From TrEMBL, chain A:
Signal peptide: none
Gene Ontology, cellular component aspect: chloroplast thylakoid membrane; photosystem I
Protein name: Photosystem I reaction center subunit IX
Keywords from the UniProt entry: Chloroplast, Membrane, Photosynthesis, Photosystem I, Plastid, Thylakoid, Transmembrane, Transmembrane helix
Source species taxonomy: Eukaryota, Viridiplantae, Streptophyta, Embryophyta, Tracheophyta
Automatic annotation (TrEMBL), chain B:
Gene Ontology CC annotations of this record: chloroplast thylakoid membrane; photosystem I
Residues reported in the UniProt entry to bind chlorophyll a 1: H23, Y170, H171
Protein name from the UniProt record: Photosystem I P700 chlorophyll a apoprotein A1
The organism of origin for this protein: Arabidopsis thaliana
Binding site for chlorophyll a 27: Y590, H667
Sequence positions that bind chlorophyll a 8: W179, S185, H189
UniProt gene name: psaA
Known role: PsaA and PsaB bind P700, the primary electron donor of photosystem I (PSI), as well as the electron acceptors A0, A1 and FX. PSI is a plastocyanin-ferredoxin oxidoreductase, converting photonic excitation into a charge separation, which transfers an electron from the donor P700 chlorophyll pair to the spectroscopically characterized acceptors A0, A1, FX, FA and FB in turn. Oxidized P700 is reduced on the lumenal side of the thylakoid membrane by plastocyanin.
Binding-site residues for chlorophyll a 21, renumbered to this chain: W432, H440
UniProtKB/TrEMBL annotation, chain E:
Protein function: PsaA and PsaB bind P700, the primary electron donor of photosystem I (PSI), as well as the electron acceptors A0, A1 and FX. PSI is a plastocyanin-ferredoxin oxidoreductase, converting photonic excitation into a charge separation, which transfers an electron from the donor P700 chlorophyll pair to the spectroscopically characterized acceptors A0, A1, FX, FA and FB in turn. Oxidized P700 is reduced on the lumenal side of the thylakoid membrane by plastocyanin.
Origin organism lineage: Eukaryota, Viridiplantae, Streptophyta, Embryophyta, Tracheophyta
Residues of the full protein shown: 589 to 661 of 734
Family membership noted in the UniProt record: Belongs to the PsaA/PsaB family.
Positions of chlorophyll a B1 binding: H66
Organism: Arabidopsis thaliana (Mouse-ear cress)
Protein name: Photosystem I P700 chlorophyll a apoprotein A2
Quaternary state and interactors: The PsaA/B heterodimer binds the P700 chlorophyll special pair and subsequent electron acceptors. PSI consists of a core antenna complex that captures photons, and an electron transfer chain that converts photonic excitation into a charge separation. The eukaryotic PSI reaction center is composed of at least 11 subunits.
Subcellular location: Plastid, Chloroplast thylakoid membrane
Amino acid sequence: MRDLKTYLSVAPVISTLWFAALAGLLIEINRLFPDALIFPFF
Amino acid sequence: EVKILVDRDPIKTSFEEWAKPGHFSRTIAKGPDTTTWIWNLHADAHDFDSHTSDLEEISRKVFSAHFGQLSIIFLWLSGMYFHGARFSNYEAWLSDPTHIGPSAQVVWSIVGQEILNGDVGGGFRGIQITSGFFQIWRASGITSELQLYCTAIGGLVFAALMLFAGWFHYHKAAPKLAWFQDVESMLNHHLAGLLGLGSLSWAGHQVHVSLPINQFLNAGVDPKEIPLPHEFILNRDLLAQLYPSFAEGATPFFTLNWSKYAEFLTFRGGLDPVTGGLWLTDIAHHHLAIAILFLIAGHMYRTNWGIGHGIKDILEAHKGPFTGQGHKGLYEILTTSWHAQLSINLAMLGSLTIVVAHHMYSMPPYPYLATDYGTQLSLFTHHMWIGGFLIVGAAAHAAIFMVRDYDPTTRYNDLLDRVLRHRDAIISHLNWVCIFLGFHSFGLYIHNDTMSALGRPQDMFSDTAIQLQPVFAQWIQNTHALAPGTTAPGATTSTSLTWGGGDLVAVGGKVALLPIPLGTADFLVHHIHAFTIHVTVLILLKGVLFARSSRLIPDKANLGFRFPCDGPGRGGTCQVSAWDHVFLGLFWMYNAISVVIFHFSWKMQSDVWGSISDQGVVTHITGGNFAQSSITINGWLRDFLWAQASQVIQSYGSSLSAYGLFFLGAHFVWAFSLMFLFSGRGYWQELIESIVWAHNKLKVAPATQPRALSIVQGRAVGVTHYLLGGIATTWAFFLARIIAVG
Amino acid sequence: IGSSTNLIMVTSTTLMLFAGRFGGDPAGFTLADTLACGTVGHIIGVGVVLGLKNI
Amino acid sequence: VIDEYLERSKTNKELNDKKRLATSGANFARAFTVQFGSCKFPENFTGC
Amino acid sequence: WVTFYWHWKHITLWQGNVSQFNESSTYLMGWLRDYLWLNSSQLINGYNPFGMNSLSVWAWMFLFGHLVWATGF
Ligand code: CLA
Ligand code: CLA
Ligand code: CLA
Ligand code: CLA
Ligand SMILES: CC1=C(/C=C/C(C)=C/C=C/C(C)=C/C=C/C=C(C)/C=C/C=C(C)/C=C/C2=C(C)CCCC2(C)C)C(C)(C)CCC1
Ligand SMILES: CC1=C(/C=C/C(C)=C/C=C/C(C)=C/C=C/C=C(C)/C=C/C=C(C)/C=C/C2=C(C)CCCC2(C)C)C(C)(C)CCC1
Ligand SMILES: CC1=C(/C=C/C(C)=C/C=C/C(C)=C/C=C/C=C(C)/C=C/C=C(C)/C=C/C2=C(C)CCCC2(C)C)C(C)(C)CCC1
């Protein structure tokens, strides 16, 4: 378990997990709000 | 003797080696001092010959890597089958193959990319595919999606089995060295077992499954009314109604009166008028004959018994006029190192791939394949590129062997020494041939351009002013056209419609095949092809032969295989290694393949492909302008590059828009490559010094000190980007044109 | 039984086996030798029969 | 090919194009099911 | 880049329509299609299999330049 956790903390794996999470969040945000060109909340 | 020898649990499976990167090499395993360490960790990952010196470990690693590659390939096949099963219009395309475009991919609706879902046909929207899988499935007899789903599940199961087999053969029972060094048994099993038995089983499948279903489909029966494939096996009455010979059973086969099977084993040749492809009976007959030939040929080498041949005895006992004693110590060389075998197999595979592309474009073996132009173009270009890459890699591995595995004391060969003793004459003659061929081939075009630019069209090398006709090719074409009349009485017609002589074949109002004329332009392009091939051969041979030593550097073998240079002395010694020779020959392979694919595309669009009206006239796509516009460089630039790029640049706002975007993106990448090919390391290092100072001022200095890329790394990056950009540009242009116009 | 093809194949197989015998046995003749001789005789017989039938 | 299956196809020519169109429509809608409304966040468990 | 910008703006101004530059200059595909491919049609037709005109020499020079560029590589 220690060695598996150490391997999971290597740079490419952490990078791909972080970027997958970011891409998913961005895609979901763009799906909920389809188009956006200016900031209209104010 | 021949035996099974294994070692039990040579390695123990654990995650402790996953935590520490670069465990294979001690220098890498020590730790990262600078950033270059990272760039090394991926470069030496697969160099098993440098990790250790024992052949046993290298062989075991190679076996496991092969198993993993097989698992990946099986996963890819399963994915393709699942996509065909779920997201596709195969059932709609089956009924009306001529008026429906195949599609097996569906795009989501997140950003606005839904415009990529074009109107392919059959009540479906998606991306039109050019893999040619639909024709394969139709020729196999598949008429539903449940069978495709079952095939995908089987592929997944086989991929899992391959992965488990790889793990088992590396970590549980690993074969010994003597197991791999038995080439006679391996050759016998690969010839008789892998090739003969597989082709025999495929011929049996074609006889029992493909032929009746395809006959029913060609008759006009609806795909939903065709009996299931196992009904033909279960019901002999159906097969008797279809092919009466089956009513006699297997009795004729043992009775040697094989003529009774003439109904479904024919030798007619030519193309099928209904589908524009080869007859399936001919294919089954060919597979049966090939199975017989391979099964007979698989029993040549002596293994474990008295009868057979010894490869070493055959090599040693060879006597000839020009050879002499010759092949005496080649067996040990071939059975000692992996690199020589890798080079030989790579070259053979590349040549076979090129031959496959030629034979596939010439004689279409699948139904409704000739009339689908995009599939033909994609297959031809893809197979040509793969063959070129393999042929290039063969020389690199040959140079690697000559550098690091060649010693004339323990393992000495006479032929290799004789070749190495007169390399100067070979190089000089090849250089002269390349110079002469290039001068003539390009001077003809330059003379044509100059004469046409001066208002002198009567002085050019053309079909009207000065004719240079390929007489030998025309003679061969006439002989092939007249072949089935007297020389081959068994065949009803000629093998291919390409030969000058015969009739035109068209399917569904579109031309399938017609004889191809040959003129001055074909002469010029063939000579250009020969010139490019000769230059590439010269580069690769000069790289291979002068790897160990040279007149300029007498001890080049001590420096190794991958070194940038020797120094600024001797006037300059940049790019003296064989790796640099391979990196230089990649460019010429790219050039040659690009020229070949351009020639094929223009000639096929101009002289073969087209449409036919009801009256009987044939209108080609470009109206036959190849014979008069391809004799000058301006014609190539205007009538091919400028004229045929209208579709790709005007594809914005349509379903092909993606292609257009690629047509730009690849261009960018190409330019990017130049940055890595025109500069050097010192400038970048000196700039990184100032950048690192600016970082140091704000306490954000990393422990791993940044370093500029090495010279070899920069050259590799440049060549990779160049090749990728060029190939992607050609891909986008070809696909956009052939989809929008055909 | 008794047809021309049967006689031709039988004669070819027997002749090939007899030739392969010389030029638990007094002279070493393992099963592999018999199988190879029979297969070669069968190949020759099939070839000659199909050639004769093709005229 | 025995002209009885051809006659069967002629008799059942209708509804065959309907089945083909339905299969193609289902294959296309397999990607737009969520945007349509069905197969939403509930009932995705062992569904679609 | 500077010369491309100047030439395209002035050629659209002279030709009588300024909307082409005002609309197609905001993306690079417009630069590739409405400037080079469109304007090269008369230049590349200096000499053809049928004949030639007074632009022929320029066409030759065009190709000539390309060759030298490649030789530099
Ligand atoms: C590279 C090949 C090439 C070739 C073959 C030609 C060929 C030709 N050109 Mg073109 N040309 C070229 C490139 C080429 N050109 C280029 C790059 C340009 C510059 C843009 C031009 C520009 C050009 C112009 C401006 C003109 C031509 C014209 C001509 C013709 C004139 C021939 C002549 O008078 O001298 C031939 C002279 C010789 C001495 C021949 C030498 C070769 C001999 C036969 C050697 C053979 C070797 C033998 C086998 C040795 C074996 C030894 C053994 C016995 C022991 C000829 C058909 C002229 C024309 O009007 O034609 C219609 C013309 O006015 N050319
Ligand atoms: C008649 C039986 C036989 C068969 C079918 C094969 C077939 C194959 N061998 Mg060869 N081989 C044999 C005998 C046989 N071998 C013997 C006796 C030896 C020892 C001298 C070798 C030594 C050998 C080596 C060292 C290597 C191969 C490799 C390969 C594979 C080539 C990859 C490819 O071309 O794709 C064709 C793809 C397919 C047809 C996949 C189908 C899966 C097959 C049918 C698996 C069953 C094969 C196996 C021999 C039987 C199982 C026995 C076990 C259950 C007890 C292929 C699976 C190479 C390979 O890729 O390694 C994995 C490789 O590196 N072989
Ligand atoms: C048939 C399979 C084959 C095999 C098993 C090998 C095996 C070997 N090769 Mg050979 N080789 C082959 C074919 C093959 N080669 C071909 C076809 C070529 C011609 C290009 C070469 C040319 C070649 C060179 C020039 C060198 C070798 C060397 C080596 C060794 C090191 C491998 C390595 O570290 O790579 C590990 C993997 C990589 C470094 C990955 C690099 C990234 C690639 C280039 C990118 C491709 C990108 C992709 C296609 C595009 C999509 C982009 C997307 C990702 C965004 C290894 C023993 C090296 C050596 O040192 O030998 C002693 C060496 O210098 N090979
Ligand atoms: C398009 C530009 C270009 C051109 C023309 C050349 C030309 C050549 N290359 Mg280079 N090369 C290039 C780009 C180019 N290269 C690039 C980008 C690379 C990648 C780094 C290389 C890398 C490279 C390698 C690795 C090799 C070459 C070699 C060669 C020579 C091949 C032999 C031959 O065909 O000569 C015949 C001549 C020509 C085709 C050139 C054009 C001549 C025309 C017909 C004009 C002649 C007209 C007349 C005589 C001029 C007189 C006018 C004057 C009096 C005013 C030739 C000099 C090979 C070599 O040198 O071996 C022999 C070789 O091994 N090249
Ligand atoms: C497509 C595909 C697939 C599938 C496959 C299959 C389904 C296969 C099958 C196969 C098979 C199914 C095979 C078979 C084979 C067979 C054989 C190989 C046989 C043989 C035989 C013999 C050799 C015989 C002999 C004899 C004689 C000669 C005489 C008398 C006696 C006897 C009988 C003994 C999978 C999913 C996987 C993957 C993906 C793709
Ligand atoms: C080119 C290529 C490809 C393809 C491939 C293929 C398509 C393959 C196939 C293959 C095959 C198709 C194979 C087969 C095999 C087979 C086998 C291996 C068999 C075996 C058999 C046996 C073993 C038998 C046995 C028996 C029985 C059962 C009965 C009687 C007795 C006896 C014992 C004989 C791809 C796309 C991937 C890509 C890359 C390249
Ligand atoms: C004298 C004597 C005896 C006897 C012996 C014997 C009787 C032996 C053997 C014999 C024999 C008589 C053997 C063999 C047989 C046969 C075989 C072994 C065959 C095989 C075949 C095959 C393998 C075929 C194949 C094929 C096919 C299937 C198709 C077409 C092509 C071919 C032809 C290739 C005893 C001991 C009683 C006593 C003492 C004395």
